[PDB]
Coordinates of C-alpha atoms and ligand atoms in Angstrom, one line a residue:
Chain A
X1 CA 43.1 -2.5 8.1
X2 CA 40.8 -4.5 10.3
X3 CA 37.5 -3.0 9.0
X4 CA 34.9 -5.8 10.3
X5 CA 36.6 -6.4 13.9
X6 CA 36.7 -2.8 14.7
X7 CA 32.8 -2.5 13.7
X8 CA 32.1 -5.5 15.9
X9 CA 34.1 -3.8 19.0
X10 CA 32.0 -0.4 18.3
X11 CA 28.7 -1.9 18.3
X12 CA 29.8 -3.9 21.6
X13 CA 31.1 -0.4 23.1
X14 CA 27.6 1.0 22.0
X15 CA 25.6 -1.3 23.9
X16 CA 27.7 -0.9 27.0
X17 CA 27.7 2.7 27.3
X18 CA 23.9 2.9 26.3
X19 CA 22.3 0.2 28.3
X20 CA 25.1 0.5 31.2
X21 CA 25.6 -3.3 31.3
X22 CA 29.1 -4.8 31.7
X23 CA 31.6 -5.2 28.9
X24 CA 32.2 -8.9 29.9
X25 CA 28.6 -9.6 29.7
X26 CA 28.0 -8.3 26.1
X27 CA 31.2 -10.1 25.0
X28 CA 29.6 -13.2 26.7
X29 CA 27.5 -13.5 23.2
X30 CA 30.3 -14.9 21.2
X31 CA 28.0 -16.4 18.7
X32 CA 26.3 -13.2 18.4
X33 CA 29.1 -10.8 17.7
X34 CA 30.4 -12.5 14.8
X35 CA 31.3 -10.9 11.3
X36 CA 27.8 -12.0 9.8
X37 CA 25.5 -11.4 13.0
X38 CA 27.0 -8.2 14.6
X39 CA 24.7 -5.8 12.9
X40 CA 21.7 -8.0 13.0
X41 CA 19.2 -5.7 15.4
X42 CA 16.5 -8.2 15.6
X43 CA 18.9 -10.9 17.0
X44 CA 20.8 -8.2 19.2
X45 CA 17.6 -6.8 20.7
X46 CA 16.2 -10.4 21.6
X47 CA 19.6 -11.5 23.0
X48 CA 19.8 -8.3 25.4
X49 CA 16.2 -9.1 26.6
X50 CA 16.7 -12.8 26.9
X51 CA 20.1 -12.5 28.9
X52 CA 19.5 -9.3 31.1
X53 CA 15.7 -9.6 31.5
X54 CA 14.8 -5.8 31.6
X55 CA 11.2 -6.8 32.7
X56 CA 12.5 -7.7 36.1
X57 CA 13.5 -3.8 36.5
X58 CA 9.4 -3.3 36.8
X59 CA 9.0 -2.7 40.5
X60 CA 12.4 -0.5 40.4
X61 CA 15.9 -2.6 40.5
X62 CA 18.3 -3.1 43.3
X63 CA 20.9 -1.0 42.4
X64 CA 23.2 -3.7 41.5
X65 CA 25.9 -2.8 39.3
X66 CA 26.2 -3.2 35.4
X67 CA 22.4 -3.5 35.6
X68 CA 20.4 -2.4 32.8
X69 CA 17.4 -1.0 35.4
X70 CA 18.7 2.5 35.5
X71 CA 18.5 2.3 31.6
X72 CA 15.2 0.8 31.8
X73 CA 13.9 3.4 34.3
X74 CA 15.4 6.4 32.1
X75 CA 13.9 5.2 29.0
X76 CA 10.7 3.0 29.8
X77 CA 9.4 2.7 33.4
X78 CA 9.9 6.2 34.9
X79 CA 10.3 8.0 31.6
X80 CA 8.0 11.0 31.4
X81 CA 7.7 10.5 27.6
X82 CA 9.8 7.6 25.5
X83 CA 11.8 9.2 22.8
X84 CA 10.8 7.7 19.5
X85 CA 7.7 6.3 21.1
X86 CA 5.9 10.0 21.9
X87 CA 2.3 10.4 22.2
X88 CA 1.6 6.4 21.8
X89 CA -1.0 4.7 23.8
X90 CA 1.0 1.2 23.9
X91 CA 4.6 0.9 24.3
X92 CA 6.6 -2.4 24.0
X93 CA 10.2 -2.1 25.9
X94 CA 11.3 -4.7 23.4
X95 CA 10.5 -2.3 20.9
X96 CA 12.5 0.4 22.7
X97 CA 15.4 -1.9 23.1
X98 CA 15.4 -2.7 19.3
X99 CA 15.4 1.3 18.3
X100 CA 18.1 1.8 20.8
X101 CA 20.1 -1.2 19.4
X102 CA 19.1 0.0 15.5
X103 CA 20.7 3.5 16.5
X104 CA 23.7 2.1 18.2
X105 CA 24.2 -0.2 14.9
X106 CA 24.0 2.7 12.7
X107 CA 26.3 4.9 14.7
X108 CA 29.0 2.3 14.6
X109 CA 30.8 2.5 11.3
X110 CA 30.7 6.3 12.1
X111 CA 32.3 6.1 15.4
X112 CA 34.8 3.4 14.9
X113 CA 36.1 4.9 11.7
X114 CA 36.3 8.4 13.4
Chain B
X1 CA -25.3 -23.0 24.0
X2 CA -26.4 -22.2 20.6
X3 CA -29.2 -23.5 18.0
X4 CA -28.7 -22.0 14.5
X5 CA -31.5 -21.9 11.9
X6 CA -30.7 -20.8 8.3
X7 CA -33.2 -19.4 5.7
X8 CA -33.3 -17.7 2.0
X9 CA -32.0 -20.8 0.1
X10 CA -33.3 -21.6 -3.3
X11 CA -33.4 -21.8 -7.3
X12 CA -31.4 -18.9 -8.9
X13 CA -30.2 -18.4 -12.4
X14 CA -26.3 -17.8 -13.6
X15 CA -25.4 -14.1 -12.7
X16 CA -28.5 -14.0 -10.1
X17 CA -28.2 -12.9 -6.3
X18 CA -29.4 -14.5 -3.2
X19 CA -29.3 -13.4 0.5
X20 CA -29.1 -16.1 3.1
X21 CA -29.7 -15.4 6.8
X22 CA -29.1 -17.2 10.0
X23 CA -31.3 -16.8 13.3
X24 CA -29.1 -17.7 16.4
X25 CA -30.8 -18.0 19.8
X26 CA -28.4 -18.3 22.7
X27 CA -26.5 -15.9 24.9
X28 CA -23.3 -13.8 24.3
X29 CA -24.1 -13.7 20.4
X30 CA -22.1 -10.8 19.6
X31 CA -18.9 -12.5 21.2
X32 CA -19.1 -15.1 18.6
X33 CA -17.4 -15.2 15.2
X34 CA -20.1 -16.4 13.1
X35 CA -19.2 -18.3 9.6
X36 CA -20.9 -19.7 6.4
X37 CA -19.8 -23.0 4.9
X38 CA -21.0 -24.9 2.0
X39 CA -20.8 -28.5 0.7
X40 CA -21.4 -29.1 -2.9
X41 CA -22.7 -32.6 -4.4
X42 CA -19.6 -34.9 -4.0
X43 CA -17.5 -32.3 -2.3
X44 CA -16.3 -31.5 1.4
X45 CA -17.7 -29.0 3.4
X46 CA -15.8 -25.9 2.8
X47 CA -15.6 -22.4 4.6
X48 CA -17.1 -19.7 2.6
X49 CA -17.1 -16.5 4.8
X50 CA -16.8 -15.4 8.8
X51 CA -17.5 -12.3 10.4
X52 CA -15.4 -12.1 13.8
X53 CA -16.8 -10.9 17.4
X54 CA -15.1 -7.5 16.3
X55 CA -17.0 -7.5 13.1
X56 CA -14.1 -8.1 10.7
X57 CA -15.0 -10.3 7.4
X58 CA -12.9 -13.0 6.0
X59 CA -13.6 -14.7 2.9
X60 CA -12.5 -17.8 0.9
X61 CA -10.9 -17.0 -2.2
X62 CA -13.6 -18.4 -4.4
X63 CA -16.3 -16.4 -3.0
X64 CA -13.9 -13.1 -2.8
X65 CA -15.7 -9.9 -4.5
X66 CA -19.2 -11.6 -4.9
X67 CA -20.4 -12.5 -1.3
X68 CA -20.7 -10.1 1.6
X69 CA -21.1 -11.6 5.2
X70 CA -23.1 -9.0 7.7
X71 CA -24.1 -9.5 11.3
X72 CA -26.9 -7.8 13.4
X73 CA -26.2 -8.1 17.1
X74 CA -29.8 -6.8 17.9
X75 CA -31.5 -9.3 16.2
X76 CA -29.0 -11.9 16.8
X77 CA -28.7 -12.6 12.7
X78 CA -25.9 -13.2 10.3
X79 CA -26.3 -12.7 6.7
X80 CA -24.8 -13.9 3.1
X81 CA -25.4 -11.7 0.5
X82 CA -24.4 -13.9 -2.7
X83 CA -24.3 -11.9 -5.9
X84 CA -23.0 -13.1 -9.6
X85 CA -23.8 -16.7 -8.8
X86 CA -22.3 -19.3 -11.1
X87 CA -23.4 -23.0 -11.2
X88 CA -19.9 -23.9 -9.2
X89 CA -22.0 -22.2 -6.0
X90 CA -24.8 -24.8 -6.3
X91 CA -24.4 -26.5 -2.5
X92 CA -25.9 -26.7 0.9
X93 CA -25.0 -23.6 2.8
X94 CA -24.7 -24.1 6.4
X95 CA -24.4 -21.3 9.4
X96 CA -21.9 -22.1 12.2
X97 CA -20.7 -20.4 15.7
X98 CA -17.3 -20.1 17.0
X99 CA -16.8 -19.4 20.7
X100 CA -13.8 -17.1 20.0
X101 CA -11.5 -16.6 23.0
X102 CA -12.5 -20.2 24.4
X103 CA -12.5 -22.5 21.4
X104 CA -10.3 -23.2 18.2
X105 CA -13.7 -25.0 16.5
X106 CA -17.1 -23.9 15.1
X107 CA -18.8 -26.0 17.5
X108 CA -22.3 -24.9 16.6
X109 CA -23.8 -25.6 13.2
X110 CA -27.4 -25.4 11.5
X111 CA -28.9 -28.0 9.6
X112 CA -28.6 -26.1 6.1
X113 CA -30.0 -24.2 3.4
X114 CA -30.0 -25.3 -0.2
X115 CA -29.0 -23.2 -3.1
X116 CA -29.0 -24.3 -6.8
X117 CA -27.7 -22.2 -9.5
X118 CA -29.4 -24.0 -12.6
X119 CA -27.8 -24.5 -16.0
Chain C
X1 CA -4.0 -1.2 44.9
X2 CA -4.5 -4.5 42.7
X3 CA -6.0 -3.6 39.0
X4 CA -8.5 -6.3 37.1
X5 CA -6.9 -7.8 34.1
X6 CA -9.2 -9.7 31.5
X7 CA -9.3 -11.0 28.1
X8 CA -11.8 -10.2 25.4
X9 CA -13.5 -12.4 23.8
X10 CA -11.3 -14.7 25.8
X11 CA -7.8 -15.8 26.6
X12 CA -7.7 -19.0 24.4
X13 CA -6.7 -17.5 21.0
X14 CA -6.1 -19.1 17.7
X15 CA -3.0 -18.5 15.7
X16 CA -2.9 -15.0 13.8
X17 CA -6.2 -14.3 15.4
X18 CA -7.0 -11.3 18.0
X19 CA -7.4 -10.6 21.7
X20 CA -7.8 -7.7 23.8
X21 CA -6.1 -7.5 27.2
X22 CA -8.1 -5.1 29.4
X23 CA -6.4 -3.6 32.8
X24 CA -8.9 -1.4 34.7
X25 CA -9.1 0.0 38.4
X26 CA -11.1 2.2 40.2
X27 CA -7.5 3.9 41.5
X28 CA -6.9 6.6 38.8
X29 CA -3.6 5.3 37.5
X30 CA -2.1 7.6 34.8
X31 CA -0.1 4.5 33.4
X32 CA -0.3 0.8 33.5
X33 CA 2.3 -1.8 32.8
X34 CA 1.1 -5.1 31.3
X35 CA 3.9 -7.6 32.1
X36 CA 4.2 -11.1 29.9
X37 CA 6.1 -14.2 31.3
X38 CA 6.7 -16.7 28.9
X39 CA 9.4 -17.8 26.2
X40 CA 9.6 -13.9 25.3
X41 CA 9.6 -11.5 28.2
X42 CA 8.4 -8.1 27.7
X43 CA 6.6 -5.0 29.4
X44 CA 3.8 -2.9 27.9
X45 CA 3.5 0.6 29.0
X46 CA -0.3 1.8 28.7
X47 CA -1.8 5.0 28.9
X48 CA -4.6 5.0 31.8
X49 CA -7.7 6.2 30.2
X50 CA -10.0 7.9 32.7
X51 CA -13.7 8.1 32.5
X52 CA -16.2 8.4 35.8
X53 CA -14.3 7.2 38.2
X54 CA -12.2 4.2 36.4
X55 CA -8.7 4.0 34.7
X56 CA -8.8 1.7 31.7
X57 CA -5.9 0.6 29.2
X58 CA -6.4 -2.2 26.4
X59 CA -3.4 -4.0 24.7
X60 CA -4.9 -5.4 21.5
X61 CA -3.2 -8.3 20.0
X62 CA -3.9 -8.2 16.3
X63 CA -2.2 -11.5 15.4
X64 CA -1.5 -14.2 17.9
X65 CA 1.9 -15.6 17.8
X66 CA 4.1 -17.7 20.0
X67 CA 6.0 -14.9 21.4
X68 CA 3.0 -13.0 22.9
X69 CA 1.7 -16.1 24.6
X70 CA 2.5 -16.1 28.3
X71 CA 1.3 -15.5 31.9
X72 CA 0.1 -11.6 32.0
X73 CA 0.2 -9.6 34.9
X74 CA -1.1 -5.6 34.9
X75 CA 0.3 -3.2 37.4
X76 CA -0.9 0.4 37.9
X77 CA 2.0 3.2 38.1
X78 CA 1.6 5.3 41.2
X79 CA 4.5 7.8 41.1
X80 CA 7.7 8.8 38.9
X81 CA 10.0 10.8 41.5
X82 CA 9.5 8.3 44.5
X83 CA 9.2 5.4 41.8
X84 CA 6.2 3.2 42.8
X85 CA 4.0 0.6 41.0
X86 CA 0.9 -1.1 42.5
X87 CA 0.6 -4.8 43.6
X88 CA 0.2 -6.9 40.3
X89 CA -3.6 -8.1 38.9
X90 CA -4.3 -11.6 39.3
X91 CA -2.2 -13.5 36.7
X92 CA -3.8 -14.2 33.3
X93 CA -2.7 -16.8 30.9
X94 CA -3.1 -15.9 27.0
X95 CA -2.4 -19.4 25.3
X96 CA -2.2 -20.1 21.7
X97 CA -4.7 -23.2 20.8
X98 CA -5.5 -24.9 18.1
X99 CA -2.0 -26.4 17.0
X100 CA -2.4 -30.2 17.8
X101 CA -5.1 -33.0 17.0
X102 CA -8.0 -32.3 19.7
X103 CA -8.5 -34.2 22.5
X104 CA -11.9 -36.1 23.8
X105 CA -13.8 -35.2 26.8
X106 CA -16.1 -37.3 28.8
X107 CA -18.2 -37.4 31.7
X108 CA -27.3 -31.8 41.7
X109 CA -25.0 -32.0 44.5
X110 CA -23.2 -35.0 43.4
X111 CA -19.1 -35.2 42.4
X112 CA -18.7 -34.9 38.6
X113 CA -15.3 -36.0 37.0
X114 CA -14.2 -34.8 33.6
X115 CA -11.8 -36.8 31.5
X116 CA -9.4 -35.4 28.9
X117 CA -8.1 -38.2 26.5
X118 CA -6.2 -38.5 23.1
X119 CA -3.6 -41.0 21.4
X120 CA -1.1 -38.2 21.2
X121 CA 1.4 -38.1 23.8
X122 CA 0.6 -34.9 25.7
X123 CA 2.7 -33.9 28.7
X124 CA -0.2 -31.8 30.3
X125 CA -3.8 -31.5 30.0
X126 CA -6.0 -28.2 30.5
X127 CA -9.6 -28.0 31.4
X128 CA -11.7 -24.8 30.8
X129 CA -14.9 -23.8 32.0
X130 CA -16.5 -21.6 29.3
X131 CA -16.4 -17.7 30.6
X132 CA -13.7 -18.5 33.4
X133 CA -10.6 -16.7 32.9
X134 CA -8.7 -19.1 34.7
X135 CA -7.9 -22.9 33.7
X136 CA -7.0 -26.2 35.3
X137 CA -4.1 -28.1 34.6
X138 CA -2.9 -31.8 35.4
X139 CA -0.2 -34.2 33.7
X140 CA -1.1 -37.0 31.4
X141 CA -0.6 -40.7 32.4
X142 CA -0.3 -43.6 29.9
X143 CA -3.4 -46.2 29.5
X144 CA -3.1 -49.8 28.0
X145 CA -5.5 -48.7 25.4
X146 CA -2.5 -46.4 23.7
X147 CA -4.4 -43.5 25.1
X148 CA -3.2 -40.9 27.6
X149 CA -5.4 -39.3 30.0
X150 CA -6.0 -36.8 33.1
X151 CA -9.1 -37.0 35.3
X152 CA -10.3 -33.5 36.6
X153 CA -12.5 -33.6 39.8
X154 CA -15.4 -31.0 40.0
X155 CA -16.6 -31.8 43.3
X156 CA -21.1 -24.9 32.7
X157 CA -19.8 -25.5 29.3
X158 CA -16.3 -27.4 29.3
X159 CA -13.5 -28.1 26.8
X160 CA -10.1 -29.9 26.9
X161 CA -6.9 -29.2 25.9
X162 CA -3.4 -31.1 25.5
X163 CA -0.1 -29.5 25.6
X164 CA 3.8 -30.2 25.6
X165 CA 6.5 -29.6 28.2
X166 CA 8.7 -27.1 26.1
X167 CA 5.7 -25.0 25.1
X168 CA 3.4 -24.7 28.0
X169 CA 1.2 -22.0 26.5
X170 CA 0.8 -23.7 23.1
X171 CA -2.4 -26.0 23.1
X172 CA -4.1 -28.3 20.9
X173 CA -7.3 -27.8 19.2
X174 CA -10.2 -27.7 21.6
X175 CA -12.2 -30.8 22.3
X176 CA -16.1 -30.9 21.4
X177 CA -17.6 -28.8 24.3
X178 CA -19.3 -30.8 27.1
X179 CA -22.3 -29.4 29.0
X180 CA -22.4 -30.4 32.4
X181 CA -26.2 -29.8 34.0
Ligands
LIG201 C1 11.0 -14.1 32.2 O1 10.2 -13.6 33.2 C2 10.0 -14.6 34.6 C3 9.2 -14.2 35.4 O2 9.2 -12.6 35.7 C4 9.2 -12.1 37.1 O3 7.8 -12.1 37.6 C5 7.0 -11.4 37.4 C6 5.6 -11.8 38.2 C7 7.3 -10.0 37.7 O4 7.7 -9.8 39.0 C8 8.7 -9.6 36.6 O5 9.0 -8.3 36.8 C9 9.5 -10.6 37.3 O6 10.9 -10.5 36.3 C10 11.3 -15.0 34.9 O7 11.3 -16.1 36.0 C11 12.0 -15.7 33.6 O8 13.4 -16.1 34.3 C12 12.3 -14.7 32.6 N1 13.1 -15.3 31.3 C13 14.0 -14.8 31.0 C14 14.8 -15.4 30.2 O9 14.7 -13.9 31.7
LIG202 C1 -11.3 -2.0 25.3 O1 -11.4 -3.2 24.5 C2 -12.9 -3.6 25.4 C3 -13.1 -5.2 24.9 O2 -13.0 -5.3 23.3 C4 -13.8 -2.8 24.7 O3 -15.3 -3.1 25.1 C5 -13.6 -1.5 25.2 O4 -14.3 -0.4 24.6 C6 -12.1 -1.0 24.7 N1 -12.0 0.3 25.3 C7 -11.5 1.6 24.4 C8 -11.1 2.8 25.2 O5 -12.0 1.2 23.3

């Protein structure tokens, strides 16, 4: 019955399990996870960079729980090859976050419905 | 840093062509963006073409397809090949230099070369 | 060990224009991490290109935006398993210039002082010696002539810029150059 609130909750669960950040922290962006902007890939990727500052993971991280740093190491800093940006002279971490958000948003109607 | 000297100006019939040159005598020439500007009688000085430190060209829409800007980093020279000239192109043509990466302006200017497209 | 970071043709970039940031070192780093601190933080992973004892990487900005302005630092990538990065390069400010009205700049072995003035209420003034990657900054004070100013004691070719508090990497049009001899 509630098609859109289910899709908003699937995008939130997608960010949580992919980026390894807390459920409470993703849900904090109340203005972002509304019916008009829950699937706005650009706004979500910029919000993730603004709030978690993954560039602070440059030197390695600290082992803090629900930190984006393990995701940043596995997909950017300590990656042998970045998936989606393979054989690329210059890769922007924000573009890698954006590509990840774009897959989350696409797979959201498939997962929530099923 | 620079002193720019234009040449090649003169009288030309409509549909004719003319090649202007600019000699620049300063250090780091290849790093400057070089431009051509023109001032027609009673009008404000306007941009005509620019050649970036990287060799990329830019043109005013009024000159697009008819003029070609080029640079020679061995001789420290800029050229403006002007084809299909119409009486609207009559103006004093100026050579200018911009220290890209350090300035937002064309700080260096030549004294001009007159171009007249008769009748 | 600390790599070098420079801007070509320079770090004071007009809107929609180009700049190349070069990371280089005599340590043969397989990769470089170019970090930007500004209104939109980011890290760029660059391939370390090797030739005759040097490892270099270029980051080309093909169209200067507010998002790309900031303080940049380059790090060389050492290892993946015991994760290690080198010491950062010296900080390099990549600034957007030409956004506001140009200020005015006024002037062997003597103390020379250069002054930055404008009627615009700039919060900060920036002095630039042409060819030198680092700029000097100083706040602006009001004068009874309805003009804000900053005096830079020198103790080359110079240019002056104004900026506001809420956008420290977005500067005005450069003042007319002042040759000091
Ligand atoms: C943007 O980044 C600022 C500085 O980044 C930190 O210092 C540099 C030198 C590197 O060590 C980097 O890994 C560090 O993260 C932060 O002060 C600032 O808070 C950041 N902005 C936001 C919104 O997170
Ligand atoms: C990097 O950029 C600099 C400055 O434009 C240039 O001289 C150099 O050739 C570039 N490196 C490569 C590998 O093209």
